[PDB]
Ligand binder design. Structure first.
Ligand SMILES: C[C@H](CCC(=O)NCCC[N+](C)(C)C[C@H](O)CS(=O)(=O)O)[C@H]1CC[C@H]2[C@@H]3[C@H](O)C[C@@H]4C[C@H](O)CC[C@]4(C)[C@H]3C[C@H](O)[C@]12C
Ligand SMILES: Nc1ncnc2c1ncn2[C@@H]1O[C@H](COP(=O)(O)OP(=O)(O)O)[C@@H](O)[C@H]1O
Ligand SMILES: [Mg+2]
Ligand SMILES: [Zn+2]
Ligand SMILES: [Zn+2]
Ligand SMILES: [Zn+2]
Lengths: 75, 185, 590, 186
RNA sequence: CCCAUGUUAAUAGCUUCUUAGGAGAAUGACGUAGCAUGCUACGC
RNA sequence: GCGUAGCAUGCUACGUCAUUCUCCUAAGAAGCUA
């Protein structure tokens, strides 16, 4: 299962972004929503992975909101 | 069921069973039937009380468990979701997601959304010279498993910087963290 | 209401009932705790009392579980089974629990009354969750000791700023200073109602208790005063966040051409960058509180919170930042109640500024990029736990010296606490050695360093000064009067008053006396700024007038004396009481 | 039940029965005492189940009385809330122009859709992009509903204030559209 | 014989499950009254 | 042979207690459909 793990990681990733109060910045939430809905309606895994890169790079863009060195440490 | 009323019903049942095993006669037989019946009805009333009590205990166990688990799940929702996300991201094992995450651990995070179009603009901060050395070569810039052409490197004091100043020796004279503006190849 | 056992972190639902803090306890640990001590009350999701109509049995060794309630031995239904059985008190998660052996220490922490010398050394070499629990129960004991103080009642109102008080018979008088706030009452028939939060100070003439108040009420005869008690908030964060030696600096960006003054401190700045928390130890006036400002000027993009336990330590830090740091991007936090006046030159109560300053109790829940905790000798594990619960940050720098004077520990009366038990960090500086060390007295004249490098620090200090010939110390016995518990010495104020008409340049000197009450009472004879030795730690002065009040164990404490005499930048006059200490220093005779 | 005299009668009949069992009276007397104990137990059953039914019913009536009191208190609270809402919306009217247009109608009825359009003092324009902004309210005054409006504020979709010097063709990408421009009637 | 501190979620339909109340039924058991017959103790 | 008293057994009525069923209502959780 490779196509349907990116379609579920978009759901988890947009839930994380929404919990970090991305949606108080409307120009950013419009692009995050558009990337989410484009991944979910995708039939080719390459374009889904490019949109997933673009969407995840919103989460990595905000510095102190996550603690990436702690979350990635356990893996 | 091992209740005091079961002790009484047990001794009455034993007496009636033995006397009907003899089975002689007749008025004391009816008296024993009556004593057994009244003791048995007392036992069944007590067993009904026990069943009602154990049913209420069972509902209490279920309702307490549901309340405890539900409030615990709704409390740790942020951390559980973030841990779940990074588990799923490691499971995909993509070579672009891994690259942008392994850069974002070190401190090389983008300042905007990574673009998809050919020849669009990405501004990533590079904190230390070694992180520059790992990602940049000449003027190419290997990020998100894509090649980017560096346009412009500014400093934390917002002064433009040429890519020839970035040296193993001149770097302590720089003002980190650089902001690299690059364009997709 | 589930939780985690303190001494093995298993899941559990019990709580010991006789312990003041109600620590969560697993089943096996709760059996170990209620089978050895006299703490026999346990609370589950409901208490373990006998649910008879009327019965008072609480001892968990006695109760039985039957139906859906806990009954004593003489009310149990025949479907019942004992709680305190098989070595495990029955609670939730009974069979997923791990026993422990620290119940020979947890008993001593939860049982003791914190008066002896050993309880603090046991509250500081246990595990981390026991360190938090011990600090919490020590705070609770210190809070419920304040209920043992007397109760005040007004006899007459001599003046609107001069009450007259009579205290309860047989109960000890509280000490009268702005730490202890009282609440008023008019409870007669007729309004058992609080009539304002007051605070006292003993006026100089007569038995007048000059009161400050929140309100503007007229006080009658019958108004009577009860001390307030503050509830101890439970604490969660570890005392010391675990260290992680990095490979290279993270989160901090160093600077080009920092200054010519902090140029010799660059290596320690790189060390602060590399570690997670670092500890700095130096003898007094040797750049410790200066180092924090140098950390400000070496990592200019780094948001910093400076913290201390006093208010004059954080005010000394505030002054140093005023001299060096840019004053637009700085702040200062004052609590709303604020019985004492603080430093007011920064934009007060604006925590979003890049350089926040605070007392450790009044910190706001925020983040940082390096947090500087100055004066760790005055910190208890409650304070380090609070600073680790509120402030989330990338690097911690704990600055201070163990040889100055500690947190007072009011309950401690039998024994003496060595430095390595003051808190966890002072233990770390006296167990493995400090990470950063700077000893060279850049503040006090070489006479002060010459006499203070023989008392505590055994010949390890040299000064960047010389004998400045303004260090006078005299020996005058000073026949004492007694205030509530803080003695007051009139004739030594007399000789100081003599040393004020006959030395004109010294009228900017600061009065230093070990007792709070004499510090208040020598302002009305002299008029100098006044500071107590316990609250003077960290701020220096040009000229200092120290007066040893009484020959006791408190004012003849060499650490208190050291922190008293190492604050004079250029000149000091020391009116001594003890003969040997007056012979121990080497001043002029006077 | 216990305070009822039926419990006392049943208890003393049981005491008499135990005393006669220990006393060994004649079998007819024992049958008589069993009969009296049985009728005492029947009366006890009647009265005790009667009081149990009674107290169940009384607790039911108490619960429904609680429900009625809660319903009537909440009705009072909602009536207060509706009345204060109506009276604040009364104080918010613009009574000069409203009186003018209502007294200019030949019957006294005017359509609701032209109550704001001729008496509102604030006009909120919501603008989705830049060409619309250039066409409807360029500059600091414009025209709509045959009046002249002066722009008092422009916020974006994030409730952030946007200065009028920002809204240009090259800074149109960096604004969080739509823009809510609030204007006042001149 | 004492010193520091307070931070927005529609209308309607169907279905599953749980709890509570009431009614009715069915069985069993106890107790009271009434009846059917038999037996025994007394009178005629 | 009858009347009275007691005892047995069977039926009918009423009062209670347990088990089961059906239904009606109330309250809650959830799912699908337009
Ligand atoms: C009767 C029943 C088990 C009896 C048994 O079968 N023992 C057999 C022996 C096996 N061992 C291991 C228990 C010993 C016991 C075991 C766990 C008990 C519950 C929780 O504690 C507390 C909870 C909150 C309130 O307090 C009252 C209700 C609750 C739901 C309790 C109900 C009842 O009280 C329970 C079910
Ligand atoms: N590098 C230095 N060179 C010269 N003098 C210094 C240096 N650092 C600090 N000082 C002086 O020494 C004093 C030490 O002050 P401070 O840091 O408050 O000491 P402490 O932390 O022990 O209270 C300051 O008044 C400062 O003027
Ligand atoms: Mg200092
Ligand atoms: Zn205890
Ligand atoms: Zn345990
Ligand atoms: Zn009891």
């Amino acid at each position: 299962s490779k196509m349907s793990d990116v379609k579920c990681t978009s759901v988890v990733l947009l839930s994380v972004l929404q919990q970090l109060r991305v949606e108080s910045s409307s120009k950013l939430w419009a692009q995050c929503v558009q990337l989410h809905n484009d991944i979910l309606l995708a039939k080719d895994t390459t374009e889904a992975f490019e949109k997933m890169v673009s969407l995840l790079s919103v989460l990595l863009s905000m510095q102190g909101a996550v603690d990436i060195n702690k979350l990635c440490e356990e893996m | 069921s091992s209740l005091p009323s079961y002790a009484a019903f047990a001794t009455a049942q034993e007496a009636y069973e033995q006397a009907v095993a003899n089975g002689d006669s007749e008025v004391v037989l009816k008296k024993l039937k009556k004593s057994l019946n009244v003791a048995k009805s007392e036992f069944d009333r007590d067993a009904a009380m026990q069943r009602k009590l154990e049913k209420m205990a069972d509902q209490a166990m279920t309702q307490m468990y549901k309340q405890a688990r539900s409030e615990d799940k709704r409390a740790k929702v942020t951390s559980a979701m973030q841990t779940m996300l990074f588990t799923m991201l490691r499971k995909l094992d993509n070579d672009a997601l891994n690259n942008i995450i392994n850069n974002a651990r070190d401190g090389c995070v983008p300042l905007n959304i990574i673009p998809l179009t050919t020849a669009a603009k990405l501004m990533v901060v590079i904190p230390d010279y070694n992180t520059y050395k790992n990602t940049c070569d000449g003027t190419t810039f290997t990020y998100a498993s894509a090649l980017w052409e560096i346009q412009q490197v500014v400093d934390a004091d917002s002064k433009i910087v040429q890519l020839s100043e970035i040296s193993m020796d001149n770097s302590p004279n720089l003002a980190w963290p650089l902001i690299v503006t690059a364009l997709r190849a | 209401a589930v939780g985690a056992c303190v001494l093995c972190n298993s899941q559990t639902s019990l709580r010991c009932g006789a312990c003041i803090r109600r620590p969560f306890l697993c089943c096996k640990c709760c059996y170990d705790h209620v089978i050895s001590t006299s703490h026999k009350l346990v609370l589950s999701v409901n208490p373990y009392v006998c649910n008879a109509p009327g019965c008072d049995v609480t001892d968990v060794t006695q109760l039985y579980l039957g139906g859906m309630s806990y009954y004593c031995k003489s009310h149990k239904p025949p479907i019942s089974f004992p709680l305190c059985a098989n070595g495990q008190v029955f609670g939730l998660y009974k069979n997923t629990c791990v026993g422990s052996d620290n119940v020979t220490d947890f008993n001593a922490i939860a049982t003791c009354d914190w008066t002896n010398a050993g309880d603090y050394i046991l509250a500081n070499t246990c595990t981390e969750r026991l360190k938090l629990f011990a600090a919490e129960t020590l705070k609770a004991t210190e809070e419920t000791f304040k209920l043992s103080y007397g109760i005040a009642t007004v006899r007459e109102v001599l003046s609107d700023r001069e009450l007259h008080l009579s205290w309860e018979v047989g109960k000890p008088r509280p000490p009268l200073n702005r730490n202890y706030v009282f609440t008023g009452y008019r409870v007669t028939k007729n309004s058992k109602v609080q009539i304002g939060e007051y605070t006292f100070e003993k006026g100089d003439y007569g038995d007048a208790v000059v009161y400050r108040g929140t309100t503007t009420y007229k006080l009658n005869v019958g108004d009577y005063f009860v001390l307030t008690s503050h509830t101890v908030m439970p604490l969660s964060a570890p005392t010391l966040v675990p260290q992680e030696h990095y490979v290279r600096i993270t989160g901090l960006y160093p600077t080009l051409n920092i200054s010519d003054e902090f140029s010799s401190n660059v290596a320690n700045y790189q060390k602060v960058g590399m570690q997670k928390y670092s500890t700095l130890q130096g003898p007094p006036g040797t750049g410790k509180s200066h180092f924090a400002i140098g950390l400000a000027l070496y990592y200019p993009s780094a948001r910093i919170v400076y913290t201390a336990c006093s208010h004059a330590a954080v005010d000394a830090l505030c002054e140093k930042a005023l001299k060096y740091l840019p004053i637009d991007k700085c702040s200062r936090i004052i609590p709303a109640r604020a019985r004492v006046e603080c430093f007011d030159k920064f934009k007060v109560n604006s925590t979003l500024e890049q350089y926040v300053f605070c007392t450790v109790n009044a910190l706001p829940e925020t983040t940082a990029d390096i947090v500087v905790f100055d004066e760790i000798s005055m910190a208890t594990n409650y304070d380090l736990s609070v600073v680790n619960a509120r402030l989330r940050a990338k690097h911690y720098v704990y600055i201070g010296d163990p040889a100055q004077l500690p947190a007072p520990r009011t309950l401690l009366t039998k024994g003496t606490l060595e430095p390595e038990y003051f808190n966890s960090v002072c233990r770390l500086m006296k167990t493995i050695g400090p990470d950063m060390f700077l000893g060279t007295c850049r503040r006090c004249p070489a006479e002060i360093v010459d006499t203070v490098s023989a008392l505590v620090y055994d010949n390890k200090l040299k000064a960047h000064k010389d004998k400045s010939a303004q260090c006078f110390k005299m020996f005058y016995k000073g026949v004492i009067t007694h205030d509530v518990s803080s003695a007051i010495n009139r004739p030594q104020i007399g000789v100081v008053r003599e040393f004020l008409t006959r030395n004109p340049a010294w009228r900017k000197a600061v009065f230093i006396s070990p007792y709070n009450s004499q510090n208040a009472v020598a302002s009305k004879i002299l008029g100098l700024p006044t500071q107590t030795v316990d609250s003077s730690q960290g701020s220096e002065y040009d000229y200092v007038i120290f007066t040893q009040t009484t020959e006791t164990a408190h004012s003849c404490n060499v650490n208190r004396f050291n922190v008293a005499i190492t604050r004079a930048k250029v000149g000091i006059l020391c009116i001594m009481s003890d003969r040997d200490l007056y012979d121990k220093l080497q001043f002029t005779s006077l």
